[PDB]
Amino acid sequence: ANNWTDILAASDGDEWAAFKTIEAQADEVRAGHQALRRAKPLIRLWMNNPDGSEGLVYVGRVDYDDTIRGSFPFKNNTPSQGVLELRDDNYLAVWLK
C-alpha cells in the first residue's frame, strides 16, 4: 500500500517522477498480462501403466512449434473432439504409430 504521499516522498517531491513510477508499475502489470495471454501451450502425452497398475505414466511432450496444427474446444456440458496434427518424423507421432 504505497500511498501517494509516500510515492511523492520517494520521488523527492516530483509529481512527474511519481506518476512515471506509477505508470511503470501499470505497464509491468499489463506486460505480465500480455505474456500470460501469449504464453505457449504445454502438450503432453501420458499412457497407462504397462504392468496394469494405477497412475498415468508420462510418455512425452509435443512442442507447440513442432505441431502442424491443433484445435481444442471447451464446451458447456457437451463432449468435444481435440485434433492435433504432427509430422510423422515426430517422436510422439512415431510412438503413437
Partner: protein, 52 residues
C-alpha cells in the same frame, strides 16, 4: 512537446568481482598511474584466491 524532462527512476544495482581470470578486465578503469597500472597476484604460497 514534453512538459518536463525528469531523470529516469534508476533502480537499485549490484556488482561483483572475484579476479579469477587472467588479466584485470575493462570493468576496472585505472586512474592516476594511467592504463596498465593494475594486475592480478596469485598468492599461491598461502593457497588463496588471486587478488587485485
Amino acid at each position: 512537446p514534453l512538459s518536463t524532462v525528469v531523470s529516469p527512476e534508476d533502480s537499485a544495482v549490484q556488482y561483483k568481482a572475484n579476479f579469477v581470470g587472467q588479466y584485470i578486465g575493462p570493468m576496472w578503469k585505472p586512474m592516476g598511474n594511467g592504463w596498465g597500472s593494475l594486475g592480478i597476484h596469485t598468492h599461491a604460497l598461502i593457497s588463496e584466491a588471486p587478488s587485485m
